[PDB]
Design a protein around this nucleic acid. Structure first.
Ligand SMILES: [Zn+2]
Lengths: 26, 48, 1116, 139, 48, 144
DNA sequence: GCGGCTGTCACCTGCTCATCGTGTTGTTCCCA
DNA sequence: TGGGAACAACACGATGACCTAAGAGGTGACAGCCGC
C-alpha cells in the first residue's frame, strides 16, 4: 500500500501515449 | 507476410518460424508492407 | 397554461389528460433518493389517494443497509441512523462560474457502542458534500452540467427460457434466478431428459446433488417429485448420497485445489446465495419471483430460500412435462409458460436515484471495510464514531460515478429540445446492461409492449439502434422501475375520466381501444365494431361493451421530439426517425420564431425544459432591462430574475435570453418572463419559416442539395452566434514558475499592442489566427547553458534570455470578437489544481451567416447541404413579385416517401395568408367552424396534432378561401400550386409550381469545423505517422480499401509515394519538403518506420526476423 | 531486400542482439524524471535520452561524437538509438514459449509426444517427468 | 408488413401515407423500418 | 492421421538447421524503450505502455527466484516462484492464452507483445497497410 | 481401434479516481 | 548555518486469523478425451 499510494501517476494506458501524445520532434 | 497480415498472425508466424520459411518480395500485399513498388500496373520491372 | 401564445389547433377530439411534467422521471426519483420534503409530500399525497409509493427514502435505507457493523467478536459496534442535509455552500450559478459541484453537506448520527460494557456514544458525522440535481434535472460537477440517463436493464427475477438443440432437433428448457446484486444459478433440463444445475456459471451438475446439498433427502425428493421422469432419471444417475458428500462434491467442483470440508462448503453456499449481505434479490426481484412461481409473501427484503429453488424445479420440470397451468409453490394458480427477454415486465428502469443509491452502496461498503479494520486494530475507551470512520471512499465513489460512468455524461445543450430529450432517454448500453456487440435483434426491435412506454420512432441512426431510446410522452416510472402508461377505464362500454396507470404485464390482460374511436354525446360507444389493441400486439375488434380500457391520447405512443413533427402519419417511420434525430442538432438563432405550422407541443416542451425563465409567483413587473426582470409579488416580496446573455454552452452555442414582458404586466406563477435560445414567447423555435417552391433548378438542388435566396443572408434569418473558449494555465516547472506577462520575449510591438497590462487580450477586440489571446512565458529554458555557452555569455556581458514563448494563440482557422475573460489565481481565494498558479479562460464569440456548405433540414428527415445562394432577383418569384426563399427538389418527396412536407408546405402557406370560411355549410368548413378554426387572420400560427391534425380535404378547401392580397389575387390555386416566373430570363414557368411556407432548421453540422487540411504536422510516437483528429491538424486515414483501389488502377508510384513519403519515412518526409520548398525532384522512397517497429516487435517475440539479401543480409 | 526469413531465436541470438542486461524492475525516478541504471528505460544499455548527451553530464557537451563516457557508461550519439537498441534479461529458470507450446494444435510441438494435459502438468510444476533412464543397467 | 418476430400481420395497413396512417398502423409499420435499419448497419460490415 | 500430423512438425525441424532447443527460453529480449514509452501527463501523472508492466513482473519474479536460489530455499518455494516466472513470461508473450489475463489500470486486460501484432488494430492491419498521410484534406461535398 | 461431444481456437465488432503497522536513519529541504 | 521538519529509505514482523463483484454475444473448424 505504501508503494501504491505514493505518487500514483503511472497509468498503464496505451490509449494516450500512442494516440494522444505526439512526437516532440513533430 | 501476406498470411500473417490477413489472419491468424500467431499461428502463421509460429508455423513460419518452425519451418524457417523465407518470404520472397514477389507479391502485392507483402510489397506494400515493406513499402515498395507493387508488381502490378506501372510498377512492373518492364515499366520501371 | 392559459397564458400560452395563440396557436390555432385542428384537433377534433379532446384529450382528458394533459401531458405530465417532462422531467418528473428524474426529479421525482432524486427527491426519493434524498428523501427531502417534496418526496414526503408526494408520499403522503399518494397515501391519501391510496396509490403505491416507496415509503422509505433512498439514503435512509442505504444507511439501514450498512447499519449494523461489528468486529470479529462484535465486542463493539457502529451504527448509522437518521440522516439530514445542510443548505448548499454555493448557488448553482456560483458553482457554474467558479468550477465547483452543486452539493449539499450530508450529516448522520453515527452511534458507537461497547456491548460488553453496555455503553452507547452518539456523534454526528460529516458524510460528505452530496451532489444535488438542479431543478432542471442536470447536475453541476466541476463547472460543467451533466445528465445521468436512466438505464434500461433486465429486471431481477426468474426467467424460464426455451430453445431447440438443432443437431438433435430436441426441445430444451432452462431456468435462471437473477438477483439485484448476487450471482445466478442456471438450471437446464431436457438435454438428455436430465435436469442439471449450474452454480455461478461453473460446470453443470445434476439437481439431485445440490438438492441433496441441503436438508432434502431422497425419500422426500421422490415423495414430492414422484411423477416426472427427468428428475427420477437424474437421481438414478446420481452417485453421491447423503448431505455431507453433496456439500463436499459441490465444493470440489466450485473450488478446485482446496481441502473438502463440511464447514467450508456450508459457509460457501450460505455466503454465495443465502447471505442477505452478498446476495440481494431486491423487492423488484422478490416481487418478480413471487408472481412468477406463485410463492406467497416471503420476506419482502429476502434472499432465495429453499422454497424458491424447489419452486423453480417444479416449474421447469412441469414445462418439460408439457403442463400449462398449476398451483404455484405455496400460493395461487400460476400458468406454466416461458417468458420473453424484451417484454416490459422482464425489463425495468434504473433511474438516477437508484443509480446513485448503488454507487453510495459501494462507497459505504468500502467505508464499512475500513471501519472494521479500525475496529479490530484499535482499542476501546479511545474510540468514538468519528475515530474510525473514513468517508473518503464515499466521496471518491460519488466522484467516480459523476466523472467516469457512461450513464453520467455532458448535457446536450444544442437547443432546449436536445437537452430536454437527453433527460428522457432509456439507455441500455452501459454498466450492468447490454453492450454494442452482445446485443442481438430482439432487444433492438420495438415490442408490442413498447406502446406508450418507449418511443418506436426516436432512436440513434448508428450502432446504437434500439439500445438508446426515449420515454414516451405519458410514461411513468414505477417504484419497481417498470414504465406505466395511462388508460381511461371503459366501464360497461361507457367511457369515464377514471384514468388507471398500467404496466405492460397488466396491459397484456386487458382489451385497449383507441383514443380516436368514435364516441357520441353520451359516452357510450357509437359503432358496433371498436378496434382494440389486445394482448400480444394483436389488434382485433370487439363489440364495445367488451372493451375495458381506452388510450388517453392518440399521441400517447410518441415521444416529445417526434411529437414536434406535424403530419407524422404521412411519413414512413424511417424518415420520421431521421427527422426526430436531426431536429436535436438545430443551432439556435439570433432571432427565433416558432413554426408557422407546428404541433400543439412547442409550448409545453419549452416550458418543461429549463431554458425559459418562468415566474415563481404572481405579481407585477417592475424593472425590465435586458439583463434582469424585477417583479413585485402579490405576497409583498420582490424577485429579480437575472437573465443569461451570450453564455457559452457545452457545444459552443449561445444561451442568450430575451424578455417577453414590459414594465407594467400582471404576472402569474408559471408564466414565461423571458425566452431561452431557440424560443419565441415560451414556444420552441428551432428554425425559421421559409418560402419554398418544389422544383428542379439548373442542377443546383440536384441529389437532395438545397438552393436558398441571398435574402436569408442579408436579413440574418439563419444566422447564429458561436462562442469558443481558449483556456491556458501558468505552471511551475523545475526551472522556476511560469508567469502571465505582457512583455513576451522578442516580439514586435503590434502583436501585443492588443494585450492588457496583465498580459491578457482586451475584451471586445477582434481576433484572427495567430493572435496572442493570453501572453505567457516559461521561467527559462535549459536549451544552451553548457560551459561553452556560459563562457560565450560571460564574454558577451549580456545574459541572453533563455525563456520559451508559450503564449496562448488563436487556433488556425478561427476568428471572432473577445466576448469575455475569466482569471483564477492561487494568490486569491480561487481554488486551483496542484501545480497551476493561474488559469485564464478567454471566450471569443463569432457570428455565423448561412453559407454554401452548411446543412439545413426540416421535421421530416428532408435534409440537404447548401449548394448555391442566389441573388434575390435570380430566384423564382410569385405573381405580385415576392421571391421564394428556398428551392427543394420534388424528386426526393415520393422516392424518400415522406409526403408530409408537402402537407406542411400547403398548411404553412394557408396560415400565412389567413382564411375566412365562417358559415359555408360544407363538411370541411363545418368541422373547422365547430372546432373554432374557421376564421384565421394572416400570420396566425396553427397547431397540427400528430394524430388529430388537419385533414387533406380541409387543406384543399381552405386553400380556395385564402384571404386575397391584391384585389382577389390568390397566387396559390386549389391545386396547391402557383404560377411562378424565371428570375434569370423573366419568362413564366410552363406549369404551376407547388409553393408555401416550411420550417427549415439549421443543424449544428457546421461547414467551418469539418474543413480539415494538412501538409505537415504532428506525427505519432511509436509509428512515425501523421496523427488523427482535426484539432491536431491531423492527416486522412488512407485505409486498406484505398490501397486496393490504387492497386486496381495500377497506380504504383503514387501508392509508394503516399505510403512512405507522405507518411512513415522520416528521411523521406524531411527531404520531400526540402526539395519542394527549394525546388527539386522528390527523392526515392525508403523503408517505412512501421516495418522497422514491426520487425523489432516480433524480434522481441523471439523470432530471428532478419531482412536477408540473396547474397547475405539485406540493408535494414 | 531479396527475402525476409524467420526461424527460432536461440539464446545466443538474443544475447547477440542485446547491448546490456535489464536487472532492475525500475523505469525512471519519479522525482528527477530521469532513466535509472540497469532497469527498464535505462540509458546505459539503451541509447541516450537526449541528443549528444550522457547520463552523468561529463559529456553533456554536444562536441563529443561516438565516444563512451568513463563514469556512467553512456555513449554519446543521437537520441533515436533508443528506437533501435535492444537489451536482454538472463533468466534463472528456463521457461517455455507460450506460442510453440500450449498453442494451436498443429503447432503444439508434437516433437515430444505428450497430451496437452500432461504438458500442462509438467510445465507448471505440478507433475514430474523422466528425462533419462539407464535401461541397460536396470536390466 | 413484417410483424414482430418476422411474421405477417393478418390485418394490413388499409391506407396510404396521403390518406394518413392510424396510430396502431404506424406502430405496426415501424417494426420493419427498425429491422431494415439494423440489417443495413450489420450488412455493411458483413460485405466489408 | 495423428502420425502424419506429428510428422509434419518433426520433418519441419529435421530438414532445417534451426534446432528445437529454441522452444525453451533462458533469455528474454526487451523491446527498445521508445517503442514502449512512458510520458508525463499533465497533473503529475505518467502514461506508460503495458509492456513496461509485464517486463516489471517478469524481472520481479526472476530476481526473487535468484534470491530464493541463493538462500537454498525449500523445494516448494522455489517451485512456486518458477511457476510464477513461467506464468509471467506467458503473460508477457500472450496475456490471454492461459488462465485469467493480467489487467492493467482498469479491469481491462493488459497488452501482450503478440497482441500488438494481431487483431483489427494490430500493427499489420492498422499501420502497415493503411496509414494516415500528409498533404491530405477533407470537407463536405456540394454539387457544382 | 473408431465414433460422439466438448470444449478451445479463429473471425466479426465498438474522463473520476479508498492507506499501512511501527519505529528509526540520513538526506534534503524549510524557516530563522 | 543553527534548529525544525518531509521524503525516501531501511529493518522488523503489534495473542489473531477465508473474494468480489462483474458476468445473455454468435458462427465455424477441429482435435482431443471419453465412451462404445
Ligand atoms: Zn557520463
Amino acid at each position: 500500500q505504501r508503494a501504491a499510494m505514493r505518487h500514483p501517476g503511472s497509468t498503464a494506458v496505451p490509449s494516450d501515449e500512442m494516440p494522444e501524445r505526439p512526437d516532440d520532434s513533430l | 507476410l501476406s498470411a500473417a497480415s490477413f489472419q491468424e498472425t500467431t499461428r502463421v508466424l509460429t508455423d513460419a518460424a518452425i519451418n524457417a520459411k523465407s518470404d520472397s518480395l514477389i507479391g502485392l500485399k507483402e510489397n506494400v508492407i515493406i513499402g515498395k513498388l507493387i508488381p502490378a500496373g506501372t510498377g512492373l520491372s518492364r515499366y520501371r | 397554461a392559459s397564458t400560452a401564445p395563440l396557436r390555432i389547433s385542428f384537433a377534433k377530439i379532446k384529450e382528458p389528460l394533459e401531458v405530465p411534467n417532462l422531467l418528473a422521471l428524474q426529479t421525482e426519483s432524486f427527491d426519493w433518493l434524498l428523501g427531502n420534503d417534496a418526496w414526503k409530500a408526494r408520499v403522503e399525497s399518494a397515501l391519501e389517494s391510496g396509490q403505491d409509493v416507496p415509503t422509505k427514502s433512498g439514503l435512509e435505507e442505504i444507511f439501514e443497509e450498512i447499519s449494523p457493523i461489528e468486529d470479529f467478536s462484535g465486542s463493539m459496534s457502529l451504527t448509522f441512523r437518521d440522516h439530514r442535509f445542510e443548505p448548499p455552500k454555493n448557488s448553482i450559478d456560483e458553482c457554474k462560474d467558479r468550477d465547483f459541484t452543486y452539493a449539499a453537506p450530508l450529516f448522520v448520527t453515527a452511534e458507537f457502542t461497547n456491548n460488553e460494557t453496555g455503553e452507547i456514544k452518539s456523534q454526528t458525522v460529516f458524510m460528505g458534500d452530496f451532489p444535488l440535481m438542479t431543478n432542471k434535472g442536470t447536475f453541476v460537477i466541476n463547472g460543467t452540467e451533466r445528465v445521468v440517463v436512466s438505464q434500461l436493464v433486465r429486471s431481477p427475477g426468474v426467467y424460464f427460457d426455451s430453445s431447440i438443440d438443432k443437431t438433435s432437433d430436441k426441445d430444451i428448457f432452462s431456468a435462471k434466478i437473477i438477483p439485484s446484486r448476487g450471482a445466478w444459478l442456471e438450471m437446464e433440463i431436457d438435454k438428455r431428459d436430465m435436469v442439471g444445475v449450474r452454480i455461478d456459471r461453473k460446470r453443470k451438475q445434476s439437481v439431485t446433488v445440490l438438492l441433496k446439498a441441503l436438508g432434502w433427502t431422497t425419500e422426500q425428493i421422490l415423495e414430492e417429485f414422484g411423477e416426472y421422469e427427468s428428475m427420477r432419471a437424474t437421481l438414478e444417475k446420481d452417485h453421491t448420497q447423503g448431505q455431507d458428500d453433496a456439500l463436499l462434491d459441490i465444493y470440489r467442483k466450485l473450488r478446485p485445489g482446496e481441502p473438502p470440508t463440511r464447514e467450508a462448503a456450508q459457509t460457501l453456499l450460505e455466503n454465495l446465495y443465502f447471505n442477505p449481505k452478498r446476495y440481494d434479490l431486491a423487492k423488484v426481484g422478490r416481487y418478480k419471483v413471487n408472481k412468477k412461481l406463485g410463492a406467497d409473501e416471503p420476506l419482502d427484503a429476502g434472499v432465495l430460500t429453499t422454497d424458491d429453488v424447489i419452486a423453480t424445479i417444479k416449474y421447469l420440470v412441469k414445462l418439460h412435462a408439457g403442463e400449462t397451468e398449476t398451483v404455484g409453490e405455496s400460493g395461487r394458480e400460476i400458468v406454466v409458460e416461458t417468458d420473453d427477454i424484451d417484454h416490459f415486465g422482464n425489463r425495468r428502469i434504473r433511474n438516477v436515484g437508484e443509480l446513485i443509491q448503488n454507487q453510495v452502496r459501494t462507497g459505504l461498503a468500502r467505508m464499512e471495510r475500513v471501519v472494521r479494520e479500525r475496529m479490530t486494530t484499535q482499542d476501546v475507551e479511545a474510540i468514538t464514531p468519528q475515530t474510525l470512520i473514513n468517508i473518503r471512499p464515499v466521496v471518491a465513489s460519488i466522484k467516480e460515478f459523476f466523472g467516469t460512468s457512461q450513464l453520467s455524461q455532458f448535457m446536450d445543450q444544442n437547443n432546449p429540445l436536445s437537452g430536454l430529450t437527453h433527460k428522457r432517454r432509456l439507455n441500455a448500453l452501459g454498466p450492468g446492461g447490454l453492450s454494442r456487440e452482445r446485443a442481438g435483434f430482439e432487444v433492438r426491435d420495438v415490442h408490442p409492449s413498447h406502446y406508450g412506454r418507449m418511443c418506436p420512432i426516436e432512436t440513434p441512426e448508428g450502432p446504437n439502434i434500439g439500445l438508446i431510446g426515449s420515454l414516451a410522452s405519458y410514461g411513468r416510472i414505477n417504484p419497481f422501475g417498470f414504465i406505466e402508461t395511462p388508460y381511461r377505464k371503459v366501464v360497461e362500454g361507457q367511457v369515464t375520466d377514471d384514468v388507471d396507470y398500467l404496466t405492460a404485464d397488466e396491459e397484456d390482460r386487458f382489451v385497449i381501444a383507441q383514443a380516436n374511436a368514435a364516441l357520441g354525446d353520451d359516452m357510450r360507444f357509437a359503432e358496433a365494431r371498436v378496434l382494440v389493441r389486445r394482448r400480444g400486439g394483436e389488434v382485433d375488434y370487439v363489440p364495445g361493451d367488451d372493451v375495458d380500457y381506452m388510450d388517453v391520447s392518440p399521441r400517447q405512443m410518441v415521444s416529445v421530439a417526434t411529437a414536434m413533427i406535424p403530419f407524422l402519419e404521412h411519413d414512413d417511420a424511417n424518415r420520421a426517425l431521421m427527422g426526430a434525430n436531426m431536429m436535436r442538432q438545430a443551432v439556435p438563432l439570433i432571432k427565433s420564431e416558432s413554426p408557422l405550422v407546428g404541433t400543439g407541443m412547442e409550448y409545453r416542451s419549452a416550458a418543461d425544459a429549463g431554458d425559459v425563465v418562468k415566474a415563481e409567483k404572481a405579481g407585477v413587473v417592475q424593472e425590465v432591462s435586458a439583463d434582469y426582470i424585477t417583479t413585485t409579488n402579490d405576497d409583498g416580496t420582490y424577485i429579480t430574475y437575472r437573465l443569461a446573455k451570450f453564455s457559452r454552452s457545452n457545444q459552443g452555442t449561445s444561451v442568450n435570453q430575451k424578455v417577453i414582458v414590459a414594465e407594467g404586466d400582471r404576472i402569474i406563477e408559471g408564466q414565461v418572463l423571458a425566452d431561452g435560445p431557440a424560443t419565441e414567447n415560451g414556444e420552441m423555435a428551432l428554425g425559421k419559416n421559409l418560402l419554398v417552391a418544389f422544383m428542379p433548378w439548373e442542377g443546383h438542388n440536384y441529389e437532395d442539395a438545397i438552393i436558398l435566396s441571398q435574402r436569408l443572408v442579408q436579413d440574418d434569418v439563419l444566422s447564429s452566434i458561436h462562442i469558443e473558449e481558449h483556456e491556458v494555465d501558468a505552471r511551475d516547472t523545475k526551472l522556476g514558475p511560469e508567469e502571465i506577462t505582457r512583455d513576451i520575449p522578442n516580439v514586435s510591438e503590434e502583436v501585443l499592442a492588443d494585450l492588457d497590462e496583465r498580459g491578457i487580450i482586451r475584451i471586445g477586440a477582434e481576433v484572427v489566427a495567430g493572435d496572442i489571446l493570453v501572453g505567457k512565458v516559461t521561467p527559462k529554458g535549459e536549451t544552451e547553458l553548457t560551459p561553452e555557452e556560459r563562457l560565450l555569455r560571460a564574454i558577451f556581458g549580456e545574459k541572453a534570455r533563455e525563456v520559451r514563448d508559450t503564449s496562448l494563440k488563436v487556433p488556425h482557422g478561427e476568428i471572432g470578437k473577445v466576448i469575455g475573460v475569466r482569471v483564477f489565481d492561487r494568490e486569491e481565494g480561487d481554488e486551483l489544481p496542484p501545480g497551476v498558479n493561474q488559469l485564464v479562460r478567454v471566450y471569443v464569440a463569432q457570428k455565423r451567416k448561412i453559407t454554401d456548405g452548411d446543412k439545413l433540414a426540416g421535421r421530416h428527415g428532408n435534409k440537404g447541404v447548401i449548394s448555391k445562394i442566389n441573388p434575390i432577383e435570380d430566384m423564382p418569384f410569385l405573381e405580385d413579385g415576392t421571391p421564394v426563399d428556398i428551392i427543394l427538389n420534388p424528386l426526393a418527396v415520393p422516392s424518400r416517401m415522406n409526403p408530409g412536407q408537402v402537407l406542411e408546405i400547403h398548411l404553412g402557406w394557408l396560415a400565412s395568408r389567413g382564411w375566412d370560411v365562417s358559415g359555408l355549410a360544407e363538411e370541411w368548413a363545418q368541422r373547422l367552424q365547430v372546432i373554432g378554426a374557421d376564421k384565421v387572420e394572416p400570420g396566425t400560427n396553427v397547431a397540427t396534432p400528430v394524430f388529430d391534425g388537419a385533414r387533406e380535404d380541409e387543406l384543399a378547401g381552405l386553400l380556395q378561401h385564402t384571404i386575397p392580397n391584391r384585389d382577389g389575387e390568390r397566387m396559390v390555386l386549389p391545386s396547391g400550386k402557383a404560377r411562378l416566373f424565371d428570375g434569370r430570363s423573366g419568362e413564366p414557368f410552363p406549369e404551376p409550381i407547388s409553393v408555401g411556407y416550411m420550417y427549415i432548421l439549421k443543424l449544428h453540422h457546421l461547414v467551418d469545423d469539418k474543413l480539415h487540411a494538412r501538409s505537415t504536422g504532428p506525427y505519432s510516437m511509436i509509428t512515425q505517422q501523421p496523427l488523427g483528429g482535426k484539432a491536431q491538424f491531423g492527416g486522412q486515414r488512407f485505409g486498406e480499401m484505398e490501397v486496393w483501389a490504387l492497386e486496381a488502377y495500377g497506380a504504383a508510384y503514387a501508392l509508394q509515394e503516399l505510403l512512405t513519403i507522405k507518411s512513415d519515412d522520416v528521411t523521406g518526409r524531411v527531404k520531400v519538403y526540402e526539395a519542394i520548398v527549394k525546388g527539386e525532384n522528390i527523392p526515392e522512397p525508403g523503408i517505412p518506420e512501421s516495418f522497422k517497429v514491426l520487425i523489432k516487435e516480433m524480434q522481441s517475440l523471439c523470432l530471428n526476423v532478419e531482412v536477408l539479401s540473396s547474397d547475405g543480409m539485406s540493408i535494414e | 531486400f531479396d527475402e525476409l526469413r524467420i526461424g527460432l531465436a536461440t539464446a545466443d541470438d538474443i544475447r547477440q542482439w542485446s547491448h546490456g542486461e535489464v536487472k532492475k524492475p525500475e523505469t525512471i525516478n519519479y522525482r528527477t524524471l530521469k532513466p535509472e541504471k540497469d532497469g527498464l528505460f535505462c540509458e546505459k544499455i539503451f541509447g541516450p535520452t537526449r541528443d549528444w548527451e550522457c547520463y552523468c553530464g561529463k559529456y553533456k557537451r554536444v562536441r563529443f561524437k561516438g565516444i563512451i563516457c568513463e563514469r556512467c557508461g553512456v555513449e554519446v550519439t543521437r537520441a533515436k538509438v533508443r528506437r533501435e537498441r535492444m537489451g536482454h534479461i538472463e533468466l534463472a529458470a528456463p521457461v517455455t514459449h507460450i506460442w510453440y507450446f500450449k498453442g494451436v494444435p498443429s503447432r503444439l510441438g508434437y516433437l515430444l509426444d505428450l497430451a496437452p494435459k500432461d504438458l500442462e502438468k509438467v510445465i507448471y510444476f505440478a507433475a514430474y517427468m523422466i528425462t533419462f533412464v539407464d535401461e541397460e543397467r536396470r536390466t | 408488413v413484417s410483424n414482430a418476430k418476422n411474421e405477417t400481420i393478418p390485418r394490413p395497413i388499409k391506407a396510404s401515407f396521403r390518406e394518413g396512417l392510424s396510430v396502431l398502423e404506424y406502430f405496426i409499420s415501424t417494426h420493419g423500418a427498425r429491422k431494415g435499419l439494423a440489417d443495413t448497419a450489420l450488412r455493411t460490415a458483413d460485405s466489408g | 492421421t495423428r502420425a502424419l500430423k506429428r510428422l509434419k512438425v518433426v520433418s519441419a525441424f529435421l530438414q532445417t538447421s534451426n534446432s528445437p532447443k529454441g522452444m525453451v527460453l533462458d533469455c528474454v529480449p526487451v523491446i527498445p524503450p521508445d517503442l514502449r514509452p512512458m510520458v508525463q501527463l499533465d497533473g503529475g501523472r505518467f502514461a506508460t505502455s503495458d509492456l513496461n508492466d509485464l517486463y516489471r513482473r517478469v524481472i520481479n519474479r526472476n530476481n526473487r527466484l535468484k534470491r530464493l536460489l541463493d538462500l537454498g530455499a525449500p523445494e516448494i518455494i522455489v517451485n512456486n516462484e518458477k511457476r510464477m516466472l513461467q506464468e509471467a513470461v506467458d503473460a508477457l508473450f500472450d496475456n490471454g492464452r492461459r488462465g485469467r489475463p493480467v489487467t492493467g489500470p482498469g479491469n481491462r486486460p493488459l497488452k501482450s507483445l503478440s497482441d500488438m501484432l494481431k487483431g483489427k488494430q494490430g500493427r499489420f492491419r492498422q499501420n502497415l497497410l493503411g496509414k494516415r498521410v500528409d498533404y491530405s484534406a477533407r470537407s463536405v461535398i456540394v454539387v457544382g
